[PDB]
Amino acid sequence: LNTQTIIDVNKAMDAMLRAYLNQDIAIRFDLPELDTMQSDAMVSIFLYDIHEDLQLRSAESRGFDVYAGRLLPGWVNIKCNYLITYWEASQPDNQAIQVMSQVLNALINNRQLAGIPGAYTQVVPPKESLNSLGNFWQSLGNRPRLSLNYSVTVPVSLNDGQDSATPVTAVSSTVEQTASLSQEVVSHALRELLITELGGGEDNRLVLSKVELSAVKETMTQDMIILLSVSGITRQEYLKEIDNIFDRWVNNAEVICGIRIESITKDNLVGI
Amino acid sequence: LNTQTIIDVNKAMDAMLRAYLNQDIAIRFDLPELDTMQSDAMVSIFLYDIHEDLQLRSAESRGFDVYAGRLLPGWVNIKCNYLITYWEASQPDNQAIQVMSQVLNALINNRQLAGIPGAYTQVVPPKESLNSLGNFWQSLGNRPRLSLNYSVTVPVSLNDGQDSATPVTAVSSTVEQTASLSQEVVSHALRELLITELGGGEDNRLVLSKVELSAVKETMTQDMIILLSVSGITRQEYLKEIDNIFDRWVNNAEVICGIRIESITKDNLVGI
Amino acid sequence: AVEYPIPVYRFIVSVGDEKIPFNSVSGLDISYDTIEYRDGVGNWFKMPGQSQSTNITLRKGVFPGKTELFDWINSIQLNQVEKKDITISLTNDAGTELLMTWNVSNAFPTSLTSPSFDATSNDIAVQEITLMADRVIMQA
Amino acid sequence: AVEYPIPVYRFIVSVGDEKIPFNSVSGLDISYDTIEYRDGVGNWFKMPGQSQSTNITLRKGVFPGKTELFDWINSIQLNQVEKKDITISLTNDAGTELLMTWNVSNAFPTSLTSPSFDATSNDIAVQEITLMADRVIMQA
Amino acid sequence: AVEYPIPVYRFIVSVGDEKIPFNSVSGLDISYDTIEYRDGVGNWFKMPGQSQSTNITLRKGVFPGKTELFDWINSIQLNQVEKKDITISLTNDAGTELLMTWNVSNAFPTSLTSPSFDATSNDIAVQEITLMADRVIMQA
Amino acid sequence: AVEYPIPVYRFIVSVGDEKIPFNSVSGLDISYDTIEYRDGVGNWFKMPGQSQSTNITLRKGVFPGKTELFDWINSIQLNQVEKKDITISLTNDAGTELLMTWNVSNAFPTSLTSPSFDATSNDIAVQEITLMADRVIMQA
């Protein structure tokens, strides 16, 4: 029940199936060619489609190994469908029945796969009809025959080791009294200053309508230092004057609960 | 997560897949021919159908760039489905498994595509059956094999730059008192004049039944100038007389809240 | 002139003052109740009565790091919620004109449903929100 | 003579005085209630009683710049709505004759449903409207 | 920038303090009731009223020898059940970040449904459990 | 370790003291009711109340000459019916261990439905029986 690879479930086909089969039946893991002058009596374990099964998935966080400071990769749950036929070079005791019966007694006996336990498998499921098998028998050169299919779901792992995080060492918390004014009360007082510093009016408020003033502040007097970040759009005319306004507005004797303006005056607005 | 092109998602197949594959496996982006005397061991990344996915779409307005006065093109969200097989020129450790396992460890590891992040991708989905794969194996000359499919959805952009609009400069509104009479009260008074100017009666109202009089007016006296536009159908007889009626009805001493008729007497009616 | 009807995949929904991408908008029907007064003599009076309430349930894909719909419904204290107009309008595919425009006046969201997480699917996370408003009229 | 029944794709709906293209017309059924008076002796009396109300829900594709159905339902103030006759009639495919004609007298629209915008489809915008009227009779 | 919506197959559900694999989480909707006060003069008042209750039904595959969900619901005597917070959050597929996070405060399980054993299927044993809690808010 | 969930086709149902082959077992849910007490000040109290009743409907193929389910329900006179425990438990496919075990204490059958004979099918005769019991707990 560790994390597997598609070769590790393909090698577990041969060790499962050759313990029940005869000793002199060759096992080829590819569907043979059309002419195929070959050794007689091959059992062709063909892997026709592999896809991840949505039914078995779940909500998994990447696990944390502590002794290395590393995050675990994770799994995909890929399902591998097989197709087991019997090829050659007229009785109730057929030759092709005796080999397919030896395969069938190996498939239903290994409901959980013995070389790889914990893999969720479906043995010989009713997946077929005559219409679906009609398109399959046409594919391998118009030769109808018996076919057993058997599907294993094994987890495949991703590959990374660079995603690393340190374990949590110390938890420290520091409760504090928040001031009476907030970020919202300050942002009205800065813009209504900037409307008034420009000269007020309605025609000056609409050109400054798409500019917000957001403050990150540290109140250090306890009887306060506030700095902002400016972003938006404004017209070509008042770009020069407003950039002249908050130029002088920072470096002053802090005369404007006081508004003590300091270094960061971040600009994201480009005037149009 | 910028806007892409179908070649930019096709080039991101090769840079994704060749970092996990062997160095000496050729990667052809077309399904090979039937005979194909070729270099051995090609991995054929085949793009079989591309179509826009309706699931990912949304309600988007064309964005507006301000510094250029230009409207943005927009995106289509086209989905590109692939099909990754393995071609050649008998063990559990097959040669074809070792290359398809190296492709599969590249597909499930790149759930979001590394060369092009933000593309919404589906890896190895359960899209198939034996009936659907039966019609595919018939298509490439009756040779069944393994196939992995992997679908990327990337936005493709339209191409225009002529759709241009200017940013809104000034908002000016002018409230005003609307007069006591409306467009509906005037339109009764014009037609009932025109019935009376023709001579009245029921037989004169039915021939003028399919004619409407709609007025666009400017009330300039404040103790009014009104002009109309005429449209409809009328019979061959009264076409000459009514065109004689609103001939003299415009150029007069404005004797008919007064009805001061002026220049525009737009005609859309052609008499029958 | 044949003038085929416009398809439904092209529309713009502008909530408040900002345009946001919605996956679907449903409902928004003008409705009325009927009043019947059957006489004794035999005639029948059928009049339209009180205006029935208007209910709009519109969806949206979950976008990484953008909270528009939650910050609307989080502001609901006892009954004081900000109300904003919704304008749903169909365009032509050039994107310039508005062919037919609905506006929904004074909308406030009752409920929003978080996306149904089903980890056996490859589908996209979509979250409904159910507005409720009055006086839906169509423009031209 | 075999006289096959006429298909449903050819019909004309004329609302008021102007003909307008409707995608579908449903309902328009004459209906009655039944009155039973079971005797004590044992016989049974089954008579048709009061006329049940008639409800018509007919659709229409959304057309660019043409507002017929909204300017009907916008005129509804308290109960004073203009009422106009609806004539639904099947034709022959030459388009000249009317084979079988329904008329619906004094129809007024209760509700119209705006088109369900689903931006994951290639379908066309269709808007229902639900009239309600009395005295539906069939002509010939 | 196009910014496609994140799919629903990647999420983390952490019940209490331990993370456990859930197959599906449904519901978890903020909801409100509406209050209408129709005036005599004619205007309409639509306000959001009392907060509707929040109900969450989330599934889980049956795992061999691990009893998390039963030892929660077994502790219910008369009304004293331990309550623990549920945080459902979507990630990016690297698994490091949390893009959008719901938390469900003070959840207690009403019912859990044992897996419907149907011995004519090859399906996997899944067991629902129906929590019920208050004050579901979304973070960012 | 990945530890896939166990499928539902392997289980053992032992009614009373003898094991009998059942085709399907459904339901068997622990359930509770909720009690709400909304304060005047504004806080909310959500507690789990009375235990809801437990209902189990489990099927069985009709077997030739074996009457187990009828001789159970035939013994019901006025209210005196013998009650016997039901243990439904999932195994591993070797058949030795019990991974997860439900037991249903003091079960008595209300109803059993005879097989729906439909002579246009090739299906097998299956008969439900609906037990009703209390105190379903899960073991490990």
Domains: count for chain B:
2
Nearest to C48, CA basis, from D68, D62, D129, E38: D129
Query: Chain E contact for B119, CB < 8 A?
Result: yes
Conformation bin of residue C74: beta by default, left when phi > 0, alpha when psi is -120 to 50: alpha
- Residue A257's identity, in one-letter code, is C
Domain boundary among A109, A141, A167: A167
Contact A59 E122 (CB under 8 A): no
CB A264 within 8 A of CB A246: no
Exposed/middle/buried for E17, CB within 10 Å: 0-12, 13-18, 19+?
A: exposed
Query: Chain A contact for F118, CB < 8 A?
Result: no
- Which of A13, A133, A139 comes nearest B144 by C-beta? A139
Query: Chain D contact for B37, CB < 8 A?
Result: no
| Chains near E (3 or more Cβ pairs under 8 Å) | A, B, C, F
Technique behind the model: cryo-EM
Compare all CA atoms of chain E with the CA of F32 and give the residue at the minimum distance: E110
CB A40 within 8 A of CB A50: no
What does the alpha-carbon distance between residue C62 and residue C59 come to, in Å, rounded to a whole number? Answer: 10
Pairing label, strands C29-30, D98-113? antiparallel
Mutate one of E3, E4, E8 to test the C interface: name it (highest C CB count within 10 A): E8
Contact D110 C31 (CB under 8 A): yes
What does the alpha-carbon distance between residue A133 and residue D51 come to, in Å, rounded to a whole number? Answer: 61
Residue E84 β-bridge partners: E107
Conformation bin of residue B199: beta by default, left when phi > 0, alpha when psi is -120 to 50: left
Pairing label, strands B64-65, F84-91? unpaired
Domains: count for chain F:
1
Compare all CA atoms of chain A with the CA of C122 and give the residue at the minimum distance: A54
Within 10 Å of residue E69's Cβ, how many Cβ atoms?
20
Contacts of D124 in chain C (CB under 8 A): 4-8
Contacts of B75 in chain E (CB under 8 A): 2
Q: Which residues contact F81 (CB under 8 A, 6 or more apart)?
A: F75, F108, F109
Contacts of C140 in chain D (CB under 8 A): 65, 67
Contact C122 E9 (CB under 8 A): yes
Specify the residue for token string 């008919």.
Answer: B256
Conformation bin of residue E120: beta by default, left when phi > 0, alpha when psi is -120 to 50: alpha
- Which of B57, B58, B163 comes nearest C94 by C-beta? B163
Query: Does residue A34 sit in the same domain as residue A133?
Result: yes
Mutate one of C22, C50, C117 to test the E interface: name it (highest E CB count within 10 A): C117
What does the alpha-carbon distance between residue E10 and residue E25 come to, in Å, rounded to a whole number? Answer: 12
Conformation bin of residue A95: beta by default, left when phi > 0, alpha when psi is -120 to 50: alpha
Nearest to D138, CA basis, from D107, D112, D108, D100: D100
Mapped onto helix, strand or coil, the DSSP state of residue F64 is coil
Nearest to B83, CA basis, from A51, C40, A99: A51
Within 10 Å of residue A20's Cβ, how many Cβ atoms?
15
What does the alpha-carbon distance between residue B106 and residue B54 come to, in Å, rounded to a whole number? Answer: 28
Phi, psi of B197 (to 5 degrees): -70, -30
Specify the residue for token string 């008076």.
Answer: D37
Tally C-beta pairs within 8 A across A and E. 32
Specify the residue for token string 């209050």.
Answer: E35
CB B104 within 8 A of CB A6: yes
Mapped onto helix, strand or coil, the DSSP state of residue D129 is strand
Phi, psi of A270 (to 5 degrees): -110, 125
Chain C: closest CA distance from residue D42 (Å): 32
Query: Does residue B98 sit in the same domain as residue B129?
Result: yes
Phi, psi of B116 (to 5 degrees): -145, 85
Instruction: Decide if A158 is inside a domain.
Output: yes
Nearest to B6, CA basis, from B98, B96, B82: B82
Range of the domain at E78: 1-140
Contacts of D122 in chain B (CB under 8 A): 54
- Which of E1, E4, E92 comes nearest B120 by C-beta? E4
The two three-digit tokens of residue E41, written as one number: 């003069």
| Chains near C (3 or more Cβ pairs under 8 Å) | A, B, D, E
The two three-digit tokens of residue A158, written as one number: 């991703």
Query: Does residue A110 sit in the same domain as residue A199?
Result: no
Residue D91 β-bridge partners: D98
Residue B226 β-bridge partners: B217, B261
CB B187 within 8 A of CB B213: yes
Contact D79 C47 (CB under 8 A): yes
Specify the residue for token string 């069938």.
Answer: A104
Nearest to C60, CA basis, from C92, C86, C30: C86
Q: Which residues contact A167 (CB under 8 A, 6 or more apart)?
A: A64, A66, A69
What sign has the CA pseudo-torsion B247, B250, B252, B257?
A: positive
> After which residues does chain A break, using C–N > 2.5 Å?
89, 223, 256
Mapped onto helix, strand or coil, the DSSP state of residue D90 is strand
Query: Does residue B98 sit in the same domain as residue B218?
Result: no
Domain boundary among B145, B167, B189: B167
Query: Chain F contact for A120, CB < 8 A?
Result: yes
Q: Which residues contact A189 (CB under 8 A, 6 or more apart)?
A: A259
CB C70 within 8 A of CB E105: no
The two three-digit tokens of residue C37, written as one number: 């007064």
Instruction: Decide if B77 is inside a domain.
Output: yes
Residue positions counted in chain E: 140
The two three-digit tokens of residue F96, written as one number: 């030795």
What sign has the CA pseudo-torsion B115, B121, B123, B124?
A: negative
Query: Does residue A22 sit in the same domain as residue A62?
Result: yes
Contact A1 F2 (CB under 8 A): yes
Tally C-beta pairs within 8 A across B and C. 32
CB E97 within 8 A of CB E117: no
The angle that helices B130-139 and A130-139 make with each other, rounded to 10 degrees, is: 30
Nearest to E6, CA basis, from B120, F47, C80, B62: B120
Residue positions counted in chain D: 140
Contacts of B122 in chain C (CB under 8 A): 122
CA A105 to chain CA centroid, nearest Å: 40
N-terminal to C-terminal alpha carbon distance within chain D: 20
Compare all CA atoms of chain C with the CA of B163 and give the residue at the minimum distance: C96
Distances (CA, A) of D114 to C26, C60, C130, D62, D130: 8, 19, 17, 9, 12
Mapped onto helix, strand or coil, the DSSP state of residue A95 is helix
Query: A-contacting residues of E 53-112, CB under 8 Å?
Result: 61, 94-96
Contact D62 C90 (CB under 8 A): yes
Phi, psi of B45 (to 5 degrees): -90, 100
Tally C-beta pairs within 8 A across A and F. 23
What does the alpha-carbon distance between residue E94 and residue B112 come to, in Å, rounded to a whole number? Answer: 9
Contact D121 B54 (CB under 8 A): yes
Query: Chain B contact for C23, CB < 8 A?
Result: yes
Contact E22 A122 (CB under 8 A): no
Contacts of A127 in chain B (CB under 8 A): 129-130
Compare all CA atoms of chain C with the CA of D23 and give the residue at the minimum distance: C5
- Which of C28, C36, C48 comes nearest D81 by C-beta? C48
Q: Which residues contact B184 (CB under 8 A, 6 or more apart)?
A: none
Chain D: closest CA distance from residue B77 (Å): 12
The two three-digit tokens of residue C4, written as one number: 């085929």
Question: How many alpha carbons fall within 13 Å on the CB side of residue A144?
Answer: 6
Distances (CA, A) of F72 to A23, F17, F27: 55, 13, 20
Range of the domain at A250: 179-271
Compare all CA atoms of chain C with the CA of A56 and give the residue at the minimum distance: C120
CB D15 within 8 A of CB D86: yes
What does the alpha-carbon distance between residue A23 and residue A29 come to, in Å, rounded to a whole number? Answer: 17
CB B234 within 8 A of CB B211: yes
Q: What is the resolution of this structure in A?
A: 3.8
CB B15 within 8 A of CB B115: yes
Distances (CA, A) of A108 to A16, A112, A122, A146, B198: 11, 9, 10, 17, 102
Pairing label, strands B260-267, B225-232? parallel
Q: Which residues contact A81 (CB under 8 A, 6 or more apart)?
A: A47, A48, A49, A50, A149, A150, A151
State the DSSP code for A222: -
Q: Which residues contact B264 (CB under 8 A, 6 or more apart)?
A: B216, B227, B228, B229
What does the alpha-carbon distance between residue D84 and residue A232 come to, in Å, rounded to a whole number? Answer: 55
**SS3 assignment for chain B:** CCCECHHHHHHHHHHHHCCCCCCCCEEECCCCCCCCCCCCCEEEEEEEEEEECCCCCCCCCCCEECCCCEECCCECCEEEEEEEEEECCCCCCCHHHHHHHHHHHHHCCCCCCCCCCCCEEEECCCCCCHHHHHHHHHHCCCCCCCCECEEEEECEECCCCCCCCCCCCCCCCCCCCCCCCCHHHHHHHHHHHHHHHHCCCCHHHHHCCCEEEEEEEECCCCCCEEEEEEEECCCCCHHHHHHHHHHHHHCCCCCCCCCEEEEEEEECCCCC
Q: Which residues of A touch B (CB under 8 A)?
A: 5-7, 10-11, 13-14, 28-31, 46-54, 76, 78, 127-129, 131-136, 138-141, 156, 158-159, 206, 233, 235, 270, 272
Mapped onto helix, strand or coil, the DSSP state of residue A69 is coil
Query: Chain C contact for A59, CB < 8 A?
Result: yes
Query: Chain C contact for E93, CB < 8 A?
Result: no
Contacts of E36 in chain C (CB under 8 A): 53
The two three-digit tokens of residue F12, written as one number: 């053992």
- DSSP annotation string for C37-49: ---SSS---EEEE
The two three-digit tokens of residue B31, written as one number: 């399904």
Within 10 Å of residue B195's Cβ, how many Cβ atoms?
15
The two three-digit tokens of residue E126, written as one number: 């899944």
CB B101 within 8 A of CB A6: yes
Contact C111 E136 (CB under 8 A): no
| Chains near B (3 or more Cβ pairs under 8 Å) | A, C, D, E
What does the alpha-carbon distance between residue B145 and residue B95 come to, in Å, rounded to a whole number? Answer: 13
Contact C119 A57 (CB under 8 A): yes
N-terminal to C-terminal alpha carbon distance within chain A: 63
Query: Chain E contact for B157, CB < 8 A?
Result: no
- Residue B196's identity, in one-letter code, is T
Query: Chain D contact for B59, CB < 8 A?
Result: yes
Query: Does residue A149 sit in the same domain as residue A216?
Result: no
The angle that helices A183-198 and A238-250 make with each other, rounded to 10 degrees, is: 120
Contact E6 C118 (CB under 8 A): no
The angle that helices B183-198 and B238-250 make with each other, rounded to 10 degrees, is: 120
Phi, psi of B205 (to 5 degrees): -80, -35
- DSSP annotation string for A2-61: --B-HHHHHHHHHHHHTTTS-TT-EEESS---SS----S-EEEEEEEEEEE-STT----P
Q: What is the dihedral of CA F22, F27, F30, F35, to 10 degrees?
A: -160
Nearest to D139, CA basis, from D94, D95, D85: D85
Counting CB pairs under 8 A, whether chains F and B reach 3 or more, is: no
Query: Chain C contact for B168, CB < 8 A?
Result: no
